[PDB]
Amino acid sequence: HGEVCPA
Amino acid sequence: SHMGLYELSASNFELHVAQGDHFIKFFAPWCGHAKALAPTWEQLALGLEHSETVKIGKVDCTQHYELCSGNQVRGYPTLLWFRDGKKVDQYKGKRDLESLREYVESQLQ
């Protein structure tokens, strides 16, 4: 959970 | 809004979040993690579309990147709670509809 693509 | 989902921009963000409670998805369309959330986020907004006390928003960080950066958004999706003009939480939990709805309930108490 909490996974993101970096900006 | 579009069925409860407010599209926010650099031009309207400050006005929008100044009063009340807000749950806002900062996203980029190219990001799979963000795209996978989109239908659920629409369902969340739909269920709240007639409510004044909470509004569900989104910010496309490919269009308004300085607004994202200015709110310390470092990746997508970032799900933030605003209350009366101020960022007050970041939601890092599970992104299913029920978890999101229970979080909304927790924050509106």
Curated annotation (Swiss-Prot), chain A:
Subcellular locations according to the entry: Cytoplasm; Endoplasmic reticulum
PTM text: The enzyme can be inactivated by further oxidation of the cysteine sulfenic acid (C(P)-SOH) to sulphinic acid (C(P)-SO2H) and sulphonic acid (C(P)-SO3H) instead of its condensation to a disulfide bond.
Family the entry assigns: Belongs to the peroxiredoxin family. AhpC/Prx1 subfamily.
Misc: The active site is a conserved redox-active cysteine residue, the peroxidatic cysteine (C(P)), which makes the nucleophilic attack on the peroxide substrate. The peroxide oxidizes the C(P)-SH to cysteine sulfenic acid (C(P)-SOH), which then reacts with another cysteine residue, the resolving cysteine (C(R)), to form a disulfide bridge. The disulfide is subsequently reduced by an appropriate electron donor to complete the catalytic cycle. In this typical 2-Cys peroxiredoxin, C(R) is provided by the other dimeric subunit to form an intersubunit disulfide.
The protein's assembly and partners: Homodimer; disulfide-linked, upon oxidation. 5 homodimers assemble to form a ring-like decamer.
Function: Thiol-specific peroxidase that catalyzes the reduction of hydrogen peroxide and organic hydroperoxides to water and alcohols, respectively. Plays a role in cell protection against oxidative stress by detoxifying peroxides and as sensor of hydrogen peroxide-mediated signaling events. Regulates the activation of NF-kappa-B in the cytosol by a modulation of I-kappa-B-alpha phosphorylation.
The protein, known as: Peroxiredoxin-4
Record lineage: Eukaryota, Metazoa, Chordata, Craniata, Vertebrata
Swiss-Prot record, chain B:
Gene Ontology BP, a term: protein folding
Main location: endoplasmic reticulum
The Thioredoxin domain, residue ranges: 4-109
A Gene Ontology term for the protein's cellular component: extracellular region
Keyword Transcription regulation assigned: no
Cellular compartment(s): Endoplasmic reticulum lumen
Keywords from the named record: Disulfide bond, Endoplasmic reticulum, Isomerase, Oxidoreductase, Redox-active center, Repeat, Signal
GO molecular function: protein disulfide isomerase activity; protein-disulfide reductase activity
Cysteines engaged in disulfide bonds, as pairs: 31-34
Physiological role: Protein disulfide isomerase of the endoplasmic reticulum lumen involved in the formation of disulfide bonds in proteins. Can reduce insulin disulfide bonds.
Entry similarity comment: Belongs to the protein disulfide isomerase family.
Name the record gives this protein: Thioredoxin domain-containing protein 5
Source organism of this protein record: Homo sapiens (Human)
Gene: TXNDC5
Full protein segment contained here: 190 to 295 of 432
